[PDB]
Scaffold this active site. Structure first.
Site, short mmCIF file in Angstrom:
data_model
loop_
_atom_site.label_atom_id
_atom_site.label_comp_id
_atom_site.label_asym_id
_atom_site.label_seq_id
_atom_site.Cartn_x
_atom_site.Cartn_y
_atom_site.Cartn_z
NE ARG A 87 -3.76 1.77 -0.10
CZ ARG A 87 -4.48 2.36 -1.07
NH1 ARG A 87 -4.26 2.06 -2.36
NH2 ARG A 87 -5.44 3.27 -0.85
NE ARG A 95 9.81 4.09 3.43
CZ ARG A 95 10.11 5.15 2.68
NH1 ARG A 95 9.53 5.32 1.50
NH2 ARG A 95 11.01 6.03 3.12
CG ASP A 124 9.04 -6.65 6.82
OD1 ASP A 124 9.92 -6.49 5.92
OD2 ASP A 124 9.33 -7.08 7.96
CG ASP A 145 11.25 -9.60 7.40
OD1 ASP A 145 11.37 -8.98 6.32
OD2 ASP A 145 11.31 -9.09 8.54
N1 APC Z 1 15.94 -13.06 6.12
C1 APC Z 1 15.77 -11.97 5.45
N2 APC Z 1 14.49 -11.79 4.86
C2 APC Z 1 14.25 -10.70 4.16
N3 APC Z 1 15.16 -9.61 3.90
C3 APC Z 1 16.39 -9.86 4.51
C4 APC Z 1 16.71 -10.97 5.25
N4 APC Z 1 18.04 -10.91 5.72
C5 APC Z 1 18.52 -9.76 5.26
N5 APC Z 1 17.50 -9.10 4.51
C6 APC Z 1 17.80 -7.81 3.90
O1 APC Z 1 17.03 -6.86 4.71
C7 APC Z 1 17.02 -5.72 3.85
C8 APC Z 1 16.13 -4.61 4.31
O2 APC Z 1 14.74 -5.10 4.41
P1 APC Z 1 13.73 -4.41 5.43
O3 APC Z 1 12.41 -5.07 5.06
O4 APC Z 1 13.77 -2.94 5.22
C9 APC Z 1 14.16 -4.92 7.07
P2 APC Z 1 12.75 -4.95 8.17
O5 APC Z 1 11.94 -6.20 7.96
O6 APC Z 1 12.06 -3.63 8.06
O7 APC Z 1 13.38 -5.09 9.62
P3 APC Z 1 13.75 -6.45 10.40
O8 APC Z 1 14.86 -7.17 9.72
O9 APC Z 1 14.15 -5.96 11.78
O10 APC Z 1 12.49 -7.30 10.38
C10 APC Z 1 16.79 -6.20 2.46
O11 APC Z 1 17.29 -5.28 1.55
C11 APC Z 1 17.45 -7.54 2.46
O12 APC Z 1 18.67 -7.62 1.66
N1 HHR Z 2 4.18 -6.24 15.97
C1 HHR Z 2 5.23 -6.04 15.11
N2 HHR Z 2 6.21 -5.20 15.29
C2 HHR Z 2 7.24 -5.07 14.34
N3 HHR Z 2 8.25 -4.20 14.54
C3 HHR Z 2 9.20 -4.12 13.60
C4 HHR Z 2 9.20 -4.90 12.42
C5 HHR Z 2 10.27 -4.80 11.38
O1 HHR Z 2 10.09 -5.57 10.20
N4 HHR Z 2 8.21 -5.75 12.22
C6 HHR Z 2 7.24 -5.85 13.15
C7 HHR Z 2 6.12 -6.79 12.97
O2 HHR Z 2 5.98 -7.52 12.01
N5 HHR Z 2 5.22 -6.79 13.98
MG MG Z 3 10.85 -7.23 9.31
MG MG Z 4 11.84 -6.97 5.78
#
Ligand code: APC
Ligand code: HHR
Ligand code: MG
Ligand code: MG
Ligand code: CL
EC number: 2.7.6.3
Length: 146
Positions: free
Chosen positions: A76, A80, A83, A85
């Site tokens: 959306r 940001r 996400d 992961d």
């Molecule tokens: N397991 C993983 N899954 C997804 N992205 C990963 C990852 N490990 C490293 N990354 C890297 O993380 C980078 C930034 O992604 P973001 O989505 O901005 C992190 P976030 O999810 O906001 O925070 P978080 O890692 O604390 O959850 C990507 O450019 C990617 O290369």
């Molecule tokens: N509850 C909650 N908090 C978060 N804080 C940071 C981040 C960074 O990716 N993710 C999350 C999430 O998925 N859930």
């Molecule tokens: Mg994350």
């Molecule tokens: Mg991420």
């Protein structure tokens, strides 16, 4: 290979976001969804969190190109407000410039661990740590479903 992916959204009404994401996840070539957790309204406004078991023949970096594409196309507000992961990629350990697998912080987050445990209670991490033990040890409060 079974990949486990965390889906997070901070939208106030993020159901459609997450449904958009799940659809696209299922549309990844050489892949299909095995299981999706319950959705969980988790303290950060608040997030909607879920875990997905995705069967895939993709290499991990290929999978990342796809989840990153999905964040841009379905978010959306781009990456940001959506996400995606990668928590685990089979039993692979990955520490590259782009990818740290298992996810570097998931063991600290109930919002990652409990949905994962719902769909994979017998999960063991590459290092040998067991998901059940971590939830036991940390005693993370059970989450509330969406
Ligand atoms: N397991 C993983 N899954 C997804 N992205 C990963 C990852 N490990 C490293 N990354 C890297 O993380 C980078 C930034 O992604 P973001 O989505 O901005 C992190 P976030 O999810 O906001 O925070 P978080 O890692 O604390 O959850 C990507 O450019 C990617 O290369
Ligand atoms: N509850 C909650 N908090 C978060 N804080 C940071 C981040 C960074 O990716 N993710 C999350 C999430 O998925 N859930
Ligand atoms: Mg994350
Ligand atoms: Mg991420
Ligand atoms: Cl590990």
């Amino acid at each position: 290979t079974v990949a486990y992916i965390a889906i997070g959204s901070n939208l106030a009404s993020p159901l459609e976001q997450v449904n958009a994401a799940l659809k696209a996840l299922g549309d990844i070539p050489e892949s299909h969804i095995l299981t999706v957790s319950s959705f969980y309204r988790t303290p950060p406004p608040d997030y909607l969190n879920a875990a997905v078991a995705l069967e895939t023949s993709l290499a991990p970096e290929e999978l990342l190109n796809h989840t990153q594409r999905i964040e841009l196309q379905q978010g959306r507000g781009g990456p940001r407000t959506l996400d995606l992961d990668i928590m685990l990629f089979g039993n692979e350990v990955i520490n590259t410039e782009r990818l740290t697998v298992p996810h570097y912080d998931m063991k600290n987050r109930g919002f990652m661990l409990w949905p994962l445990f719902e769909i994979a209670p017998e999960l063991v991490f590459p290092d040998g740590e067991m998901l059940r033990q971590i939830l036991h040890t940390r005693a993370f409060d059970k989450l509330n479903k969406w």
